[PDB]
Amino acid sequence: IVGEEVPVITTVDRKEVGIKLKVVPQINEGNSVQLNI
Amino acid sequence: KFVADERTNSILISGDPKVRERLKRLIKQLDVEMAAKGNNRVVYLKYA
């Protein structure tokens, strides 16, 4: 994440906004990569 | 007749020197150890 945590009413809570990439790769035993993104 | 110890894992015998001939034969007969069977296997999943 490149961004900022900003508070939001709900009370209040910290929510992150910006450029964020959450990836979980697993590699086929050669070449192709599977991505849960 | 027959004995063994699994402290030592050794056949003991009670009886003949014919029992000594044939039961040194069976001392030797089942001494063999089975080759590994790959009873378990670790498989690398490519996709799933």
UniProtKB/Swiss-Prot annotation, chain A:
Instruction: Indicate the quaternary assembly.
Output: Forms a cylindrical channel with 15 subunits; unlike E.coli no 16-subunit channels are seen. The closed pentadeacameric channels are 195 Angstroms long and 145 Angstroms in diameter. Each subunit turns in a clock-wise manner around the channel.
Function recorded in the entry: Involved in a type II secretion system (T2SS, formerly general secretion pathway, GSP) for the export of proteins. Required for secretion of cholera toxin through the outer membrane. This subunit forms the outer membrane channel.
Question: What's the impact of mutating residue 23 to D?
Answer: No complex assembly
Question: What happens upon changing residue 3 to A?
Answer: Decreased complex assembly; complex is partially open
Q: Identify the segment of the full-length protein shown.
A: 475 to 524 of 674
Mutation: residue 37 to E; reported impact is: No complex assembly
| Source organism of this protein record | Vibrio cholerae serotype O1 (strain ATCC 39315 / El Tor Inaba N16961)
Q: Which family does it belong to?
A: Belongs to the bacterial secretin family. GSP D subfamily.
Taxonomic classification: Bacteria, Pseudomonadati, Pseudomonadota, Gammaproteobacteria, Vibrionales
Q: Where in the cell does this protein reside?
A: Cell outer membrane
Q: What is known of its domains?
A: The N0, N1, N2 and N3 domains are periplasmic, while the secretin and S domains form a channel that is partially inserted in the outer membrane. The cap gate extends out on the extracellular side of the channel partially closing the channel. The secretin domain forms a double beta-barrel structure; the outer barrel has an outer diameter of about 110 Angstroms while the inner barrel forms the central gate with a small pore in the closed state.
Name used for this protein in its record: Secretin GspD
Point out the annotated site residues (description: May serve as a pivot that allows opening of the central gate for substrate egress). 3
